[PDB]
Design a protein around this nucleic acid. Sequence first.
RNA 1: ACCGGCGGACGGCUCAGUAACACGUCGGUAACCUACCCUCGGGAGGGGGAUAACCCCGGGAAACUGGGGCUAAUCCCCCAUAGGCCUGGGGUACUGGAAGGUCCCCAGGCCGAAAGGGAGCCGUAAGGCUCCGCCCGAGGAUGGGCCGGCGGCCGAUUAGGUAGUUGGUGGGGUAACGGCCCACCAAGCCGAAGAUCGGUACGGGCCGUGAGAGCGGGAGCCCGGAGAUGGACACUGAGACACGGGUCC
Lengths: 95, 242, 125, 107, 124
Amino acid sequence: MEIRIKEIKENKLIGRKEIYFEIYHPGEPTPSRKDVKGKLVAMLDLNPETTVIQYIRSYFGSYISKGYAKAYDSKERMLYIEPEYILIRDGLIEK
Amino acid sequence: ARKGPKRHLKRLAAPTSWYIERKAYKWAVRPRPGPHNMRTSIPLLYIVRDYLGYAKTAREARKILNEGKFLVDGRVRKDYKFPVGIMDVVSIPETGEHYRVLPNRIGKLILHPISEDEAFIKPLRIRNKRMIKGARVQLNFHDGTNHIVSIAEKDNYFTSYTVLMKVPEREILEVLPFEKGAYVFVTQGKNVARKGRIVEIKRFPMGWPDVVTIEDEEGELFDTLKEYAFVVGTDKPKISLP
Amino acid sequence: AIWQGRSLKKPSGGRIVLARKKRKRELGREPSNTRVAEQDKRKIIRTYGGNRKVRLTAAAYANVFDKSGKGRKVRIIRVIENPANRQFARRNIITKGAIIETEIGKAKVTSRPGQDGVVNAILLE
Amino acid sequence: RDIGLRVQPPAEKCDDPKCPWHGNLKIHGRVFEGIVVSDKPRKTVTVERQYYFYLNKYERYELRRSKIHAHNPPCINAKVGDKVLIAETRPLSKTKHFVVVAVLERA
Amino acid sequence: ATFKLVISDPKSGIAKQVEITGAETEKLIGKRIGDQIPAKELNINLNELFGKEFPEDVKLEIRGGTDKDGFPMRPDIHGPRRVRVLLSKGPGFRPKEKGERRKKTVRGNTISPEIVQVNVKLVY
RNA sequence: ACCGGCGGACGGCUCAGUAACACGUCGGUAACCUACCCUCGGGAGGGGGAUAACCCCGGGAAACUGGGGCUAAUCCCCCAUAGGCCUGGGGUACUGGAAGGUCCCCAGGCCGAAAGGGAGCCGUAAGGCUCCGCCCGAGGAUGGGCCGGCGGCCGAUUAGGUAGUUGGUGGGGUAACGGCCCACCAAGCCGAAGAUCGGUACGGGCCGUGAGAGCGGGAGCCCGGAGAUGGACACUGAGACACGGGUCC
Ligand SMILES: [Zn+2]
């Protein structure tokens, strides 16, 4: 699986950066959220504890899976802004 | 069956001047009463979320707004139902972005970037003039705002004139009169978003509105309503309207 | 109550069947038969939209003006004539068209005591 | 004087408070031309206007009449068959919502 | 006609109940609301009951009462009769809304054998 | 939990009634109301009063509810001023196509405000700043009321209908004009170009069909109108005579 970043936006009204990317993975299943987040943090040199993956969407009959994620400057702002369900899904919140 | 004011607004019945998907959802933000009409206005939530994309959900849009990070004219607005209309300056001091709200050629409202120096000027068309207690003259503008002057300056202002007003301090910069050759910009009608210079003014009996002829930069002549004609300069536009 | 809505008959002469119930906004109120008395009697009525009306039921004084803006507060003795009704004059009922007698002379009323709360009149020279 | 119409004001004055020329009545809205059909009621006149209505299916016109009752100020004493101009005003009665403002030509 | 008398002392904010069966029931019967009755008229102790030293001139003031079927006695309805009336405030009605008017059941000033409780205030 | 503020008159459901200014469209309100929100010019001075919760005693089968003590407020009341409304005599400064409108000066009267309250940071104190607040005036905006011209179904085995009915003179009432209502004057008003009466039906954007002209439908989605078992009434509120508030048959 190869990750290619299609768009980076710097939102500072909310202290975050929005990342739109794609995963090229022919002949393989949809990558797990853990693996996607790990590779994204490794490539972008981000903080693992202040980044979330909004979604990883696999299309029909395609080897490209689209992906949307965010990276926050501060964990406090991350918790304040992001919903609880997405944090639970990403595993940041033990719940 | 109807007993009082409405509090909801379906997306399929939203004003045609908005840039909104009319079938993605069922409910739209009902604009709160404010400066401009509902036809030439849009709730600030849609500007924060859809137009600029700073937010993905109404909740975080409200969270952004409550911190006073969005400025309209020169005042910080926190109500997400606040209407913003034509010839309004939306400023985001944290980003340095300044936009002017103007209608495009199809009558829809769009944000045109402007400069920091321009961000402190808001033209106002004198919609009406009357008298108040103490023998003072009150001018009512196109956006519902009001100003007061002494009887000494009675003749300095007339209906359909334009006033350049610094904001949010509300100081009078200058007065642009409405005569022949005055640069104007059409804000409504079939000729919306078209600019030119005044040529002639025609009046009719009864309450039928007066009609003004305008000449565009290409020399073509068209017509519109005298109230639709918005003065923006004497010979050239004092503000950017592309 | 006193409904003040649409008539039940077409101008041609036919009848009209109501398609809806009476609405609270189309209701009136009983006439305020302002009478001459020894003291002024008035009441306050809350009207549509929270507005206020001052209703005069018994009137004792009157503000009389004489062709020059000068005004005097005088006493009402009797109603000489009230063209609005053939019995208002007999019963001492004050309305906008009444002609009253005061110590200064005859005065024609110019206000609406049922809607104003006061009685104003102009002297007859 | 003028009340927004490009017509000559009546040559005489009247004390009627419902006359737009010499009273407090205000004219606003539609202006129509018509022929007076009846003037029996006091200070009242019925105005008849004649117009054609087009039928799409039969691609032909039919004749229709519009009847309107208008106030008749004493100065403008319109009679039967006169050509008159009427202007919309506030409701003056149950069926009177127009006022005669001029007489275009006597019968 | 057994009356439960609730005597309340305004000088201390304490109320106590007693039960009277007959004989002295007639003396209370027939009196309206707003008239005092001397304590000794039908007194039962009243001294060690409250543990005080009420003066000999102590009087009982008829404040209110309640019928057998939980029906309060309005201090305004005339006569010993039960009637259904439309109330907006006052005894026997608890609005619970802004301008609600609910029709309730109340009695009149005069006590009757049907009355089960008489509430009285001590007057010095 | 209680007082208190706001909301609960929107949203949701149905097509009974309605042939009507109910609906569609174009215009008027110079004849009118508007809680929430926006702008401008001002003000927040002095007093008083209970009562909920709570405590004592209860009843009623329940639904509900009585007496006594005690208290607070952005709760309620009063005084002052500012301010509103009418009328009369004057000046013509304003918007308007045109002033029974607005503005300025005198005169007689009626009505008649507020919470300098709350939170945070400071400051020895005093005092300061920020946030959300209260009241009056003039406009806006939102949501309405009312009115006018035009347009859209069948029956002649339904031919005369109307009598507050048509119009006026003067008033009452309404937030507002109006026979909406009242008193007095006349006989007017509608009708074979189909009044009245009877049948059917929520009106429109639209949907079905046909080469088209046209014919038929107009439940689901949107706008508008009505209803809350059938009727008739009222209280609070800006907004109701109110589907999950009230009274009677
Ligand atoms: Zn005249």
